[PDB]
Amino acid sequence: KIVNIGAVLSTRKHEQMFREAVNQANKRHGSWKIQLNATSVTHKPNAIQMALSVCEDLISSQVYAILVSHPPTPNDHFTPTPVSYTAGFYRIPVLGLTTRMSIYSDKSIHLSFLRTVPPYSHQSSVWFEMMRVYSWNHIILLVSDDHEGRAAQKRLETLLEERESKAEKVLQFDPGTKNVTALLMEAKELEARVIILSASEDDAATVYRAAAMLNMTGSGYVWLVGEREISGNALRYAPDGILGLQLINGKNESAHISDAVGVVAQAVHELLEKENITDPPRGCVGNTNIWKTGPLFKRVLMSSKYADGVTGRVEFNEDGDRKFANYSIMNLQNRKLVQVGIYNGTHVIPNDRKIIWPGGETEKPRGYQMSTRLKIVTIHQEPFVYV
Amino acid sequence: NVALVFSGPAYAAEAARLGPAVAAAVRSPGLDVRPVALVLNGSDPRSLVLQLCDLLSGLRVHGVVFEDDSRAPAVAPILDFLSAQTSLPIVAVHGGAALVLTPKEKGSTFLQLGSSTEQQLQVIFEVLEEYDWTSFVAVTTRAPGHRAFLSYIEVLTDGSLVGWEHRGALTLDPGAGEAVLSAQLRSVSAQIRLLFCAREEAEPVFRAAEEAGLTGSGYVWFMVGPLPAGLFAVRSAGWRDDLARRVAAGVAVVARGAQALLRDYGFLPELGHDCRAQNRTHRGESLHRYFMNITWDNRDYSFNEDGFLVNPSLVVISLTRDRTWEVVGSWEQQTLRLKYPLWSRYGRFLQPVDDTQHLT
Amino acid sequence: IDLLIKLARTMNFTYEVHLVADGKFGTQERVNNSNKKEWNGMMGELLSG
Structure with a gap:
């Protein structure tokens, strides 16, 4: 009959072009009887009542996939979760965007969630090779102790295991620390100067101020910093030589709006085979059984190679994540985000401008200071070491 | 005030009589019990989201126990969804909300009367060495958390005075083919194999195993989560306690748990009594700091800070000739009582490959 | 300790x-929780730092 797919959007103004985009399905594969319809409603202001407007609105509309976008307000993952809980009960495949969290990447609770936006977890992968061409060997990392912090750490150690074995000394602290510089006393004790931070949006202010008190950001040091500690308040009171990152196609909902439809529309055509094509259950007044080819539909979405839109690299791994994303290496040059290169999966640096490392040093400071003081351990052996 | 929710037509007519029955079952000073019975049925989350808040707004209840007749664990996250937001301690006796779901959301008070895979795993190995069953093979398929299952196996065979032997496969696809799986199933190095897979996905493999022919008394399987003769599994005494004791136990823990914070000072929590009467949910603390020592009827029901039981009553369940499940052994605070007296070998719960290669 | 002084002069460090x-x-022994085994004594303090 008609292929109608659900979606939830931040503003009704964002739904105006969405209807137009799906109305161009004529110049697509097949175009026999496909009739795409928006079937979308603006998200509820409160996540408690939004589940009350999907059971009788989206499920009752015979939808197959739902696209979820970040709410305009800086909510703390309030919106993305209930949709997966609602959709996951019916096992209907659901794919979203602008979800930069590592909690949606596991199938223990979120069995079906395919985000076309790379997570913060994979951001630590670029640091492994970013310092490889800069000739850096030993590093230390200050990581916040929460679900997000540990997610990046387990990845980084595995990547670094085959190149430089272990890191030097991983440091952890509670997410709500305040005036705790105890873990910074050994910061100037491991002769590293490659401090890597993956804190929260607001914790970056506390650490940067703390390091300023011990002149830790002077000459000779380098910093590698994640995206979260550049945007927002974290930019204020920051070291003069950060090498933090950003995102190119992020924060642009319309960029993935067209890409999502193209993948879904192409997926609908491939579903047409000789096997079962049973539709999902209609309505939610009474429904217990789950359509069998629902899980199969997710696998079809997994094997979708969309060669259009963002340079034709809409590809997913064994989990639903964007691939070959570009982060566009940023920098800080006297209160200015001066881009000094790019990244596209393989690191080649178009060295625009010149790098000003912390302290104003023109040449890249190697982080290593071998110590001439050693601690030596001996035990009581009568002919060898008396006491 | 304790609220009870019941789903399923089997408990529809039977939900009413347990109200006054459990009212006097447990008596504690300073608290009152007002059980309620719900006849609503339906898997769809319409009554699951409207009626519960209406009961919260109606009777101002604290502590809800849910039970289900079906074995589908698909309803647990929905209860997890409400628990973290409304700050209401939820404990499930049995049913759909009986499988452990980890990790649990921060600021949630969902408690379940079951043990994790690793906790259930370690009780198997005592049976292995009790019946002189050192050899084993570990086989499993694609599971959301199967990696941790492999890790805990070697942490006991690595030590110990007895030298153990290890073997096992990695994954099996039911759609690959029953004959194809059997050919790949030949890569074994022991007589005993461990089973850990989903309930729906367990049916095809047994038929493939029957095609492989390793379903008689000459082989054994252990199930963690058509049925070959001589099959073992652990259910944590889910079939025990009848039904009346379960609700009595369910209301016992909340009555004891509510006293944990009342002893320090007089507090009347009505934060979870509403779902639409306030637009703020920031006020919440010590959600799971309490509920560390739950002791009742000469038994311990300690719950970890994560929100799972750590002092269970693990029992092993076997199969009879009439294809019925019965309890043979049991675990109680590391005592390991064994019924069906274990004497001789290859005569109880196992048989050799052939008689002509068995001589005394 | 007669040898240690000889090295500390040739390579020019301070002890x-x-x-x-x-x-x-030094030996490896199992921890109570699972078998995350570690070293002990004079052999373990070199790895700790």
Whole structure:
């Protein structure tokens, strides 16, 4: 009959072009009887009542996939979760965007969630090779102790295991620390100067101020910093030589709006085979059984190679994540985000401008200071070491 | 005030009589019990989201126990969804909300009367060495958390005075083919194999195993989560306690748990009594700091800070000739009582490959 | 300690001796929780830092 797919959007103004985009399905594969319809409603202001407007609105509309976008307000993952809980009960495949969290990447609770936006977890992968061409060997990392912090750490150690074995000394602290510089006393004790931070949006202010008190950001040091500690308040009171990152196609909902439809529309055509094509259950007044080819539909979405839109690299791994994303290496040059290169999966640096490392040093400071003081351990052996 | 929710037509007519029955079952000073019975049925989350808040707004209840007749664990996250937001301690006796779901959301008070895979795993190995069953093979398929299952196996065979032997496969696809799986199933190095897979996905493999022919008394399987003769599994005494004791136990823990914070000072929590009467949910603390020592009827029901039981009553369940499940052994605070007296070998719960290669 | 002084002059570093904590040599033993085994004594303090 008609292929109608659900979606939830931040503003009704964002739904105006969405209807137009799906109305161009004529110049697509097949175009026999496909009739795409928006079937979308603006998200509820409160996540408690939004589940009350999907059971009788989206499920009752015979939808197959739902696209979820970040709410305009800086909510703390309030919106993305209930949709997966609602959709996951019916096992209907659901794919979203602008979800930069590592909690949606596991199938223990979120069995079906395919985000076309790379997570913060994979951001630590670029640091492994970013310092490889800069000739850096030993590093230390200050990581916040929460679900997000540990997610990046387990990845980084595995990547670094085959190149430089272990890191030097991983440091952890509670997410709500305040005036705790105890873990910074050994910061100037491991002769590293490659401090890597993956804190929260607001914790970056506390650490940067703390390091300023011990002149830790002077000459000779380098910093590698994640995206979260550049945007927002974290930019204020920051070291003069950060090498933090950003995102190119992020924060642009319309960029993935067209890409999502193209993948879904192409997926609908491939579903047409000789096997079962049973539709999902209609309505939610009474429904217990789950359509069998629902899980199969997710696998079809997994094997979708969309060669259009963002340079034709809409590809997913064994989990639903964007691939070959570009982060566009940023920098800080006297209160200015001066881009000094790019990244596209393989690191080649178009060295625009010149790098000003912390302290104003023109040449890249190697982080290593071998110590001439050693601690030596001996035990009581009568002919060898008396006491 | 304790609220009870019941789903399923089997408990529809039977939900009413347990109200006054459990009212006097447990008596504690300073608290009152007002059980309620719900006849609503339906898997769809319409009554699951409207009626519960209406009961919260109606009777101002604290502590809800849910039970289900079906074995589908698909309803647990929905209860997890409400628990973290409304700050209401939820404990499930049995049913759909009986499988452990980890990790649990921060600021949630969902408690379940079951043990994790690793906790259930370690009780198997005592049976292995009790019946002189050192050899084993570990086989499993694609599971959301199967990696941790492999890790805990070697942490006991690595030590110990007895030298153990290890073997096992990695994954099996039911759609690959029953004959194809059997050919790949030949890569074994022991007589005993461990089973850990989903309930729906367990049916095809047994038929493939029957095609492989390793379903008689000459082989054994252990199930963690058509049925070959001589099959073992652990259910944590889910079939025990009848039904009346379960609700009595369910209301016992909340009555004891509510006293944990009342002893320090007089507090009347009505934060979870509403779902639409306030637009703020920031006020919440010590959600799971309490509920560390739950002791009742000469038994311990300690719950970890994560929100799972750590002092269970693990029992092993076997199969009879009439294809019925019965309890043979049991675990109680590391005592390991064994019924069906274990004497001789290859005569109880196992048989050799052939008689002509068995001589005394 | 007669040898240590000889090295400390040729390679030009500076030392600070201290005896071991408990007084053992070094081996690997299992922890109570699972088998995240670790070293002990004089052999373990080199890895710790």
